[PDB]
Amino acid sequence: SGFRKMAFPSGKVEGCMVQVTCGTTTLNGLWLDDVVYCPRHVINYEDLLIRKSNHNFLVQAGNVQLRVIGHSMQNCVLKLKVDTANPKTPKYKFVRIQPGQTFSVLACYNGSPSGVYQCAMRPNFTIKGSFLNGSCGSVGFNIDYDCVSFCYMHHMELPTGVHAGTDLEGNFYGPFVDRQTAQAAGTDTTITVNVLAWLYAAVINGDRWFLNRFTTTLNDFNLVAMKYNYEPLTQDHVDILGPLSAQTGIAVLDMCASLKELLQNGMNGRTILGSALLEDEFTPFDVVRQCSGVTF
Amino acid sequence: SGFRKMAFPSGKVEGCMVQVTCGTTTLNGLWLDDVVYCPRHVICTSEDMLNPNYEDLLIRKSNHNFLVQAGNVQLRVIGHSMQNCVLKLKVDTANPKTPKYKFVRIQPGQTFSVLACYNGSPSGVYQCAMRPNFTIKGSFLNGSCGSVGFNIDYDCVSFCYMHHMELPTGVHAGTDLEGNFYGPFVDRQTAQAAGTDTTITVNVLAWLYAAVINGDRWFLNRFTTTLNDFNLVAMKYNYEPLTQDHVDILGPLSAQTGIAVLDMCASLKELLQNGMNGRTILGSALLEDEFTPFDVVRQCSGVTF
């Protein structure tokens, strides 16, 4: 029993964190094999990069200085070739996630990991993270079996306190650019398929007060979702919730009618899994994994 | 900017997790140097749990009855002893991944990270607090016994909790790493119930100071309170009494924001009376009590927005 916001064990990622310094800027880098990946804002980026030589980049792994032997740019990420391959390099892939998908963030300062937390890529492509100055280059990841899938690298904080970054190939999530300009996050929406997954997790843990005898259609529900700034629920979302529906005996559109009533009436002083708000940062897979005990 | 429930990086603890098997029971162990620490209930059957005599059950065991697995390698058990509710298994290999560590016993209200494990394999990490009733609201399934709670301050891992059991309400009970339980609990299948739980007042205050640091002041008011008047009201909402020690501990956060502890106590009194009126504080519609004053200072910026 119990339901917590749970991150993947960060050990395989901790062994890759390094400190990168260029001039007065100090941020974090990801050391995989003989390459260190970091935000290019550490340095017209091509014009600024041509003026830098290998010895201008200071890379520190723990108490050891790594020797930079090459440098190249891929989109908004700088790739620093080093002389030493990271002996702690785990099995890994670079993956681009979609809004609604969750991941763990290992927040770092000066190449030293300070905390790990779980979060979701919002529909507006921002992340509601917890980052201070020096956190740039901190990474987001998932673990599947023994393989680390790197999906995010932190680049910047927006005026509202939300965060923006790129995949590990340097492509931003969202209509953001790596520069100090008037940039604002778009209006955000609630991740509907994730709220439904979290309602199934509540039923599994013995919280059934919000269940009712009613069912609905995808059409009727999507009109309600549009009214309360909820993302549209697709037939793919319904299919993905199939296993949880089979386990609890509550059809996905039966649970949609429960969510419709919660949106139109509130919780009436009650909570669901110790929360007075509808939680949308657990995917259907997260709910199944946490309510099964999958290890890494 | 931002405020999240944050756990310590679990790497230093992952390198210590092993699987311990005794007969049909399989649970987790903590391998530090040449000793593996695990719940002593690993020697019990389900039947034994009603009234187990652990000394009688242990004297019948030999070293080779305990199977210890670290990754894909079998560790050889060369000794065994019991210390309170923990079994200490001497092994023939010191853990090369042993971090710098201490065993610390925490008090209610203190927070820590939990590395949840099954079969000596870590599956997840989360942050939680030792409740005033000495239970933890964790997330554990069968096989999680032996999972540990810890804090990492600088490069030293302070182990403070080892998971032993789940209570009828779904809450969890366990021991420090010397085998002493937190709370009036026993590692026995008997009628045990958690005492009535209360809100950790000093932690809710710390979290209200974190909200002010991140730019939110809607809940502040022009009032103050005496410490005794605050406690007479707070105890009516099942809040723990605030002591002079708690007021002293909140001193740095009071100095940083310019809001006296007893003025923050007045905002809390008003919040309890009125509710939030559709508003949130740090993205939450409830008053959060699982961040200590120390956690807030660690996670927040030294410059108030």
Ligand SMILES: O=C(Cc1cccc(Cl)c1)Nc1cncc2cc(C(=O)O)ccc12
């Ligand atoms: O956004 C920047 C710098 C920057 C500026 C223009 C373009 C780019 Cl790509 C990057 N840095 C920060 C990233 N994350 C959290 C941050 C918290 C703080 C803070 O809490 O003080 C300050 C800076 C923070």
Ligand SMILES: O=C(Cc1cccc(Cl)c1)Nc1cncc2cc(C(=O)O)ccc12
């Ligand atoms: O409590 C026990 C075994 C036990 C029994 C009587 C006394 C003691 Cl000391 C220990 N094991 C479990 C520990 N944690 C979470 C657990 C969740 C579940 C569950 O959710 O199914 C089951 C068992 C769980």
Ligand SMILES: [Cl-]
């Ligand atoms: Cl303590």
